[PDB]
Amino acid sequence: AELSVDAAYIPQPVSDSMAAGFLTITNEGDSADELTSVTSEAGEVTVHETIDGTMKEVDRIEVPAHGQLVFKSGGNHLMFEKLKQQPKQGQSVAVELHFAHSDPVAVKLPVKAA
Numbered sequence: 251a252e253l254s255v256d257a258a259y260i261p262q263p264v265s266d267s268m269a270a271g272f273l274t275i276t277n278e279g280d281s282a283d284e285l286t287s288v289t290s291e292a293g294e295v296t297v298h299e300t301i302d303g304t305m306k307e308v309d310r311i312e313v314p315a316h317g318q319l320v321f322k323s324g325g326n327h328l329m330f331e332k333l334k335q336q337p338k339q340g341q342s343v344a345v346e347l348h349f350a351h352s353d354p355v356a357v358k359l360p361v362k363a364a
């Protein structure tokens with residue numbers, strides 16, 4: 251339970267099926283962990299890295315000991331796919347973050363202006 255999240259939101263996408271989510275995970279513990287999956291009732295969620303403006307899926311991204319994992323625009327991000335409609339300002343998406351070596355963490359991601 252030494253993992254916590256802040257800086258969590260979704261910019262309003264120009265899409266009725268896909269969106270990027272940002273958040274920062276902080277690890278106050280002595281041992282590193284991995285984000286192993288993310289679940290949501292809104293759609294399917296995967297972790298992407300950004301590599302010269304291209305996106306790449308990654309299965310098990312590291313959250314370093316006494317460190318933080320930042321998901322932000324043009325870097326690492328959650329990718330929501332198979333959404334049913336365009337997420338809009340006023341709505342929030344809940345996800346659950348699952349870890350290799352720690353309990354799950356629920357996060358709320360409000361949809362913000364793009």
Ligand SMILES: [Cu+2]
Pocket residue numbers: 270298305306327328329
């Ligand atoms: Cu992506």
